[PDB]
Write a protein that binds this DNA or RNA. Structure first.
Ligand code: CL
Length: 123
RNA sequence: GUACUAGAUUGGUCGAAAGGCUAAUUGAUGAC
């Protein structure tokens, strides 16, 4: 297939599943921010530990600023295929084009793993 | 304009009301 230009690397299915799992566990035991306004602010404030970006966002410009900003702030980001499922994982009733984990809670080791894998995918 | 926010509308139903329940539509692409 072909990906939107804001998608900078290919994410294996098991790694996207881990991202959604991390969002759900952080929702349950830590702190997240959901929606692109809240997500971008958390990145600008240095609060985000991981940013999760859906791959089916149209128009792209809603999230296109996130990867360059995350790279500047040196905050890891990861992609999932469905904004609908990302909103569900974030505990809301509609889609979420992006989410930020602020406090991973019990997702701490999962976020570290994703971060380590993304660093290799970034090369 | 900035920050915050996860509700909102209509119909049905229950209720003495406040409103609860419920369905459809709608809201993190940020509704009210
Ligand atoms: Cl009503």
């Amino acid at each position: 297939m072909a990906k939107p230009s804001y998608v900078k690397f290919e994410v294996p299915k098991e790694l996207a599943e881990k991202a959604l799992q991390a969002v759900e566990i952080a929702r349950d035991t830590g702190k997240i921010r959901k929606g692109t306004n809240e997500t971008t602010k958390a990145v600008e404030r240095g609060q985000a530990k991981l940013v999760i970006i859906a791959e089916d966002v149209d128009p792209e410009e809603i999230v296109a600023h996130l990867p360059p900003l995350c790279e500047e702030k040196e905050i890891p980001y990861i992609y999932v295929p469905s904004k609908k499922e990302l909103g569900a994982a974030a505990g809301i009733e509609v889609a979420a084009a992006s989410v930020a984990i602020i406090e991973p809670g019990k997702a701490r080791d999962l976020v570290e793993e994703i971060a380590m894998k993304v660093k290799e995918l970034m090369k």
